[PDB]
Design a protein around this nucleic acid. Sequence first.
DNA 1: TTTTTTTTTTTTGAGCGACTGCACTACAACGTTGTAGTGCAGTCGCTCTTTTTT
Lengths: 1129, 124
Amino acid sequence: AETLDPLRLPLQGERLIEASAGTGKTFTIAALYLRLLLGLGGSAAFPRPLTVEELLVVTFTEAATAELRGRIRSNIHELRIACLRETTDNPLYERLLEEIDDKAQAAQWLLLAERQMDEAAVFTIHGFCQRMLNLNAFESGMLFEQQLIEDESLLRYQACADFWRRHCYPLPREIAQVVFETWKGPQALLRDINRYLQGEAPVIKAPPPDDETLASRHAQIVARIDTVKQQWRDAVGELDALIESSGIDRRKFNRSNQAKWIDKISAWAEEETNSYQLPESLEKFTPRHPLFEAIDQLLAEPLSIRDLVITRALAEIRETVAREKRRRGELGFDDMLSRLDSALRSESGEVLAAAIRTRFPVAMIDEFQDTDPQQYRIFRRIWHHQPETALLLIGDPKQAIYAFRGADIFTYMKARSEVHAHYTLDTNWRSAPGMVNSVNKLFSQTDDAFMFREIPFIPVKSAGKNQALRFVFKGETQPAMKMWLMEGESCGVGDYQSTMAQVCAAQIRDWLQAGQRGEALLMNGDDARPVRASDISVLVRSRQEAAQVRDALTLLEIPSVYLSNRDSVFETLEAQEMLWLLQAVMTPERENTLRSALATSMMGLNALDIETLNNDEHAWDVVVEEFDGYRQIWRKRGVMPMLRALMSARNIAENLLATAGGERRLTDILHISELLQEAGTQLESEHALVRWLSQHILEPDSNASSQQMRLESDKHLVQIVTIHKSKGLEYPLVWLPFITNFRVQEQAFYHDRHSFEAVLDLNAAPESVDLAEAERLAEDLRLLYVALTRSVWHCSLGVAPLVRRRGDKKGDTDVHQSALGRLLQKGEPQDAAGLRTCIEALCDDDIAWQTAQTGDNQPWQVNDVSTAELNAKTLQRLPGDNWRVTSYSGLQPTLTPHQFPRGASPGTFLHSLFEDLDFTQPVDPNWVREKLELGGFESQWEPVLTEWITAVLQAPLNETGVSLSQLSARNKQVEMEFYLPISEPLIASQLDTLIRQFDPLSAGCPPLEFMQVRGMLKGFIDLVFRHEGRYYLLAYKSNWLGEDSSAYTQQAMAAAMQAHRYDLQYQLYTLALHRYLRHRIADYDYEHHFGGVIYLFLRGVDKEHPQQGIYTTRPNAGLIALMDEMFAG
Amino acid sequence: QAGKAHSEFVQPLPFTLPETVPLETLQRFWAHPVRAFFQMRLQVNFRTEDSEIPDTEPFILEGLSRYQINQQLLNALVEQDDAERLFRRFRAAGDLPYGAFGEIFWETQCQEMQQLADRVIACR
DNA sequence: TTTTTTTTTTTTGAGCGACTGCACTACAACGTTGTAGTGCAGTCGCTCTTTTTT
């Protein structure tokens, strides 16, 4: 391999960058991005400079893509400034400025890149796949709009239940007994095949034929058992073998156990005494008859129906899931990869790949260790050997720890075998040189420490600026790696975990006790920093050992946080307390729910307070009254106002903040309140939110929004973090108590060493188990390298002779089966003394060891400080006056029009019919039928309605007898919208008296009450029309429910005007029309031009009665001027 | 930070022992003393919501339904009754799995309850 | 077509693998008795990761 320079990398063909742990990968990516933008390199440069929308950057994590986009934007801005200034403060920027000859064109290109930075092509894998599926949908065959689903487990369990229904129900008893012996239900089958249903479907070694069912396999195994039973029945009654010292003389009793065994073939499990009838076991303890060899051939392979059922499940459930998602039209995360791989698998899609070569003629793929084989197949389909396109796979094979998620190191080995060039980053900028030398010493003890030929380890180099980092103690300079060897011959699992957790807690309390006095320090050169509780971090692998560390650390009065805590907030007691509080708010009448909600820890009352609340009826009455007020706030204003009034009146937030350990409870209460407010806006009913909260309490499913947050940030806590959640982070002091604990893989799912394909062996072959255990050990070694390379100043290890075998003292320990002992014991099985000598053999200035001491002196010292005085500002006045733009409504035989349905919708339908219809032309019946079809009314009403409409049109509405047919199109104006200003506060007492002074209809009608309205008033006049040089107004009222006879005279219409208070509306209409005719027509007089206001009741117009239906009113011509003076100012 | 903390819930309450204390009260006390202090002295019973309807038929038997089936099978075998009639009664209600798996479950539960009844009715 | 009320919980790990006790015969030392290997049965540790994609 060679070293990598970002200004000398040839960007042609395929290149493989191996960025080690702690190296500047994001800086090298930004340097290569600037190199691709400016087109630098000379002979090794790109043939043409590319824009921002042509550089494709692919990174898995979304936060990594956002950080890289922000860093590239900052680098573009800094390089633009340095090119405009011809100077910089960075040496790489200095060499970048020295490589270019021109400055103005480069500055213009960097300015265009800064302006086009929003349209940068830096996406994720699934985002790029979705964008390529939506862009070229024709060659791929993708829908334009699809619905992504987050959780796929429900449809998978439904398809597994359907498979168990259609396969396990019609089986007979002799097959269903074996099926029940294999799995209890479909849940066990789904738990077995859940690692194979997701992702790429594996290839099954030696699959069953397609015509073999369960009954044929059962009959075959029954015949195979019956042949051995027949051969035992034929060769019974003889004994010719020699009696050995190991062979006891009770074997004839075992033959008696085989005499009663052959009764029926309804069972499936043979006797263990056939193991006594093996020629290979009897010879080791002379067998000549082939009955013993037939018994050994029967016990050579296990008689199991499991593989055929697993194959049928893997053939049926994935197909049913894909068919259901194609029927519903939904899509998944891996479905985009599968669709793009099937599109590139086709013949036309290759041309689509050329379109991708037209789209982005470059690719920089970050985090290539987390690469599915579909992704590498796509990237080989697009960017294998085409000219002018470059592929840059920037990754690290020593960090591939996501094999549980779907990643695979054999894909990386195939990629390394396919490509030709390799580049590596030499410098490490994170840790001290002592830790770097310890890592380069531990992993280079033997050859091929990762046990694979294609994964070589190279010694990395430390930084020159960080060579003075020292974690100093009270005594002297503490070394980098301190392997705490637990003393003893053989120990269990729980006892070893407890002892190493106690040793780690003792070391933590010693570092915190000496750190607060200025003894234990972190020294950079001459600068020093005391070690707080946030510096020490414990790196665990599982949740049980994390809880063990937290329990062993909280005993010594040391608070610790768990960063990998993904538990839901709805699974705590605070969600149940909030549910009880909401049930007491919704139903405050029943005292049982209110008493159960008041006694919770959220309220915080003593038993004496509850007793006095049960005894005093008046205090419970006050509580019921305030809970009814809370229910009123909850019904009017929502969830968060009710919760804030409850937390402010009861003052429970101050009591929870005063109580030690109640801040996490308060943050959980606030998050539950935020989630209840987020879920309450999407629900109309009030009990539906309570049912949703009870369901989410009963559903422990983990969403990204419904997870527990960090309780506090100001107070420093010991951060426990798993190894997978510690990838890419940084910690000063790292403790690894359970780095020697290992787990043996039992299932046989491996990868071939030649074809690099996933091979699932359903039969229990030892070669597949060994090939899976080798990959498990390689994964454990990669986890060890990830956990080791996160410390900066000091790392501590917990070593112990751990024995996974059930024997306590067998003379050998299983540390060679782990990842640490394979480097300590050089891959050889040894003892505890051998492990101690292998630890003491590699003793340097950076690597030391000490024995585990069990002992505690004192927990800690608080050393609290006082808080300064603080106050809150108070608003002096009201925030705003009553300014609102309101309207008039804000200030307030068998077929006949009398039998018309009275409502708002028929009123608006008749209003739209009178608006849309022309008054000059006669009414056509087919137009009325089409309008009734558009409205949705009955068709039988149409021939009576049109003659009623013409009866309305034939009736004149004027003091001279002017009909509606005499009005031309230019004279009429329908639905005049007006805005009327008012700058004074509208007093109802000063307005109603001014109305009653002139209007004769205000004799009764006690005055309405409304607030002071200052601002604008909206209005919609129905019709304004001129005739013989005089303007007139017309409005439509059509409710008229209480009248069916001819009683709608002028007295009833005046009573309706006084009841519905249409006098104010007509007066505002006259004022608006007066202002409109004053603004529009020059030389305007109110008495000369205005004629009156006509109200037209539609259901009151009769042919024989011209006066019924119409209502003509003229103002006194003195109220309008005073109202204009009042509205003006 | 000027608020009072949460005081302890435990407080000495006045209580006079009555004349006639029934045996049921002592049994409910010694079944759970903290629960009898909560739901009888201060009448505070934390009422949890009932469980939702499951989405599928019961393929396995575990929990309260298995305990009720075992209790009824033990009360049936203590009188030497017909186990097949109770099997048909529990199968007609749908509480058992369909087909052969319900028969296997009923057979193993009948074996366990017969092993218990051979000790129960030996000294009854 | 009218209408009546009611307060009680219960349950849940088992197969894998070792330790030790008791019996039973095989074989050599002194027909009978002590030493050794094996098998059956009751009792006890243990144990079931990691996470993020619009």
